[PDB]
Write a protein that binds this DNA or RNA. Sequence first.
RNA 1: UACCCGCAGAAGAAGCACCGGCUAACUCCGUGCCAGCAGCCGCGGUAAUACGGAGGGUGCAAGCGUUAAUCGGAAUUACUGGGCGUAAAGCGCACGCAGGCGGUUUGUUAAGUCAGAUGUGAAAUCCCCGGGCUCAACCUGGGAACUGCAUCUGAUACUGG
RNA 2: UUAGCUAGUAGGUGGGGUAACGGCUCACCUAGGCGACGAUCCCUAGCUGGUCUGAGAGGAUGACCAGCCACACUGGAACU
Lengths: 80, 82, 155, 71, 129, 205, 123
Amino acid sequence: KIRTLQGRVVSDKMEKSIVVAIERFVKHPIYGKFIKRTTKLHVHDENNECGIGDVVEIRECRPLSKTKSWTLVRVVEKAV
Amino acid sequence: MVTIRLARHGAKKRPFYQVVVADSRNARNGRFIERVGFFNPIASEKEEGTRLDLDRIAHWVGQGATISDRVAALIKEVNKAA
Amino acid sequence: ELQEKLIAVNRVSKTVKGGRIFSFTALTVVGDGNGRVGFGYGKAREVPAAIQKAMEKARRNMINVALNNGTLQHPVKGVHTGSRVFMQPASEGTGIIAGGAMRAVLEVAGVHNVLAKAYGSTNPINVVRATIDGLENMNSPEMVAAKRGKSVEEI
Amino acid sequence: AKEKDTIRTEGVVTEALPNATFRVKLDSGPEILAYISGKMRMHYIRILPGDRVVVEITPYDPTRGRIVYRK
Amino acid sequence: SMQDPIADMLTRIRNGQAANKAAVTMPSSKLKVAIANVLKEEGFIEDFKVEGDTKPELELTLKYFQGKAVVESIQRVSRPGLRIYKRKDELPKVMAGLGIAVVSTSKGVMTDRAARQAGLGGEIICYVA
Amino acid sequence: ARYLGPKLKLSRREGTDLFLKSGVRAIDTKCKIEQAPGQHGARKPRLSDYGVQLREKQKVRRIYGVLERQFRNYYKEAARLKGNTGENLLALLEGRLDNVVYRMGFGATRAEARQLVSHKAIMVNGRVVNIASYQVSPNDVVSIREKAKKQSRVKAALELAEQREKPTWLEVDAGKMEGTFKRKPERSDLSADINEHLIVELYSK
Amino acid sequence: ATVNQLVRKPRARKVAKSNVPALEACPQKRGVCTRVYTTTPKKPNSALRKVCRVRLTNGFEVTSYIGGEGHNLQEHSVILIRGGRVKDLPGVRYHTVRGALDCSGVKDRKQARSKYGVKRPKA
RNA sequence: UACCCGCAGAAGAAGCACCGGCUAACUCCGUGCCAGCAGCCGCGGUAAUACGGAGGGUGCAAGCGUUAAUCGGAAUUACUGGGCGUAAAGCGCACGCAGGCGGUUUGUUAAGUCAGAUGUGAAAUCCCCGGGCUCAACCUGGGAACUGCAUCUGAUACUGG
RNA sequence: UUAGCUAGUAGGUGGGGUAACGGCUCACCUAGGCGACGAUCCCUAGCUGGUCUGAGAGGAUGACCAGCCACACUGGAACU
């Protein structure tokens, strides 16, 4: 039972943290067009191994800071 | 604690009770956990009038739910009927 | 046995030296209650001459519609000048629920159970014109089978 | 029914306002907006800015009156 | 620019048909060829061919009946500006089943009827009657 | 809650006999049946499409003694029910107790039958029902209660009844003054110059 | 027209502007009579129509019609007003409720009495 | 108390709006662009079915009208479901970032999309078939529905990578 | 007819703190964090089951019943 998210690294500046963006398509409730929506998550990156632009697999965990409730599971693709 | 009791629905002068398991502090006709029987005191008694899921009542007792004076009676009455 | 219905009577006017000349117009439909419908439109100085000229027109200029047990084959849209028209085959028991102009057409036509509605201009002469053509272009489970070259279940 | 508190007092056309309208000054006391009576307008009867005229005044609004008698 | 070649296909059919043309031809594509297949199999056209290897030109032989075009209406439903997807229990039917809807499924392109019977939904490519 | 005024006026306006009197008399010897009430009765109504729909609904209402609110509710129920709405409307009317009491011949009129009902002279299944609009069901037995059995209205009512066409769906024992609602009447049981679909049209627009 | 466009700017229904704002969604309002007078109407009509200016309990001050034949109203008369314009009297958007508060019923009415505040005559 | 029996006598119990067209219902008298009506058109200067009274009639009925108020009809904000030459509407013209969209083949992926399974979607309400109060409102049993969300496992034609 | 917003601010280390994770708090360090997928600012408002309307899609709405929240003369505070 390993619920997980996949997204790409938009910021790697913070010490041991990263900002990840999860993008998805969604049907528009009224006009039916499929629209891009993005969800940015502050995620934990102990060891700072995640570079900007990387594609990373993340999971939900307990609060790590005022805004971090997610941590890194592993890198998928890097340095496009 | 958790209690099994009658929530009085029906209409004026025509009471109809819904037997319910609930946190004893919630209002009588308010939040409950599970519905488990009903009790019509005005049933013609030509057909039915009192129906109890005794299996779930007991399950809840087994976990410490208490029981109304009136539900404790219904249960003895229904146990006698069959 | 032909059924005939008067849909609208109207007064128009023509202007001359002496003043206004008033006349009348009449819009009617005749139908056989079993899939044939004609509409007519006549003009005359007096109303009876007009209501009568129209029936005369309505009797010829009549067309066939491929009915289906007193109801339509499939939903249909009709259009003519201002009037956009829409019709649906309803289940049995409903009857004809529709505006006056359309009801008269559908009644005399033999369409027993339908949902109808007129959009835009409800100008009677163009509403009926649009309904007739709708029913007329309405194709049949057999002709599509003929068209497509197959007598599958769909026949 | 039609009450009867109407009056017929007279006066003189003062102003020649727009749309058959006049300043008509009542011989009595003041002048009122006075409009031309339907009848009168139907029978035409132009009305110069200085004629003796009859007015119909509703106590309801003394400020106004209808010209009845043409001249 | 040429951003919907399927509408283009629909339209070339519709217009040549209206123009009582014996055939119509267009740059080919698997997806066009999959739709042409359904049209033919449901008897809306005679037949079709693709010719060439590097720049394949697809050709549809149209069909006429009582000096009439077999294809009465042919319209694009889903489109680049508004994708339309349906579930199996939501699949439209055209003319109360007399016409067809072309549906694209995990198992390739087929009619509303086919997809219905095979427990599938998909992108609703067009209607034809 | 009941129409209490002159009755033949209603027949005269609708252009037909509404059976609002016993039937002892040719109606034309009691009123000018073929002429509307009033100063301008002789006048003809060049009658609109809405007009014919209204008058047909009035006709049925005036036959059964039902005012608008209850009758509209009858339409609503006919509509909700399965099967043809127009026919469902007439089933509901024809199932009323005041009506059934009339059809078994216990009352000379539906008005008289209604009074029988209201005045606790009618039982259903040996149980007293005193509300006119009580819906009667298949196999029910409605009867004149013992104390009301010697009322001369009832004997006369049963005599007239014997001279009307006899309804199929009711089994009446004139001696016992009891009768059985065998089944709901079909459409074919009821008069054919009632145009329910007009009433159905009036209430859908 | 475009789906894209509606997705950026949704259909937006126009909000209905009222014809009796002084009522503020109340069925009637109370008010004191500021002026009580007559005024003449618009083409093609002609009369001396009874109107009053009325300061309402909510501050609004409006002109209101005084329908019926005859009325005994003056300044400081406290009246009840309801919605209802007078068509050949521009500006007039309310009617006075005859037979409420200080406003008397129409004298001697027999037909349509309830629209003119008139009791049923003993008879 | 419900309910049942008895007594007295039709005895104590009918009003409101409307009738020019839309809109079911017409005449006379009074008034005379006045007094007045008026939801919209529009009535009123000597025959007014439109004002006011009357008689007659129509529609409702312990209510009936008026006002206020939401949605409907309104395809009149148009997703379903509209328009921009002359009716309201093409920016005076071009370049162009963001954005939307994107020709054709293969492989891959499996987010969109599709399928199935599981959990959840409180009860009441709505709907269906029954049951109980003389009927109905009302009360009530069971069902169906909650067209939604989430997880897992698949499918890979179309869209995206 | 509001386009920039942010110093406990965003994160890190350690001490303290809570019933418990947590800038909850403090020191030190890094310089981040949010925002045209509408932040900030301004106006308005308790949310839901549902209610009314509409064939539907919608539109309008959140008395009475039930679920959640918030408040208890106004502002602040903790004690048990």
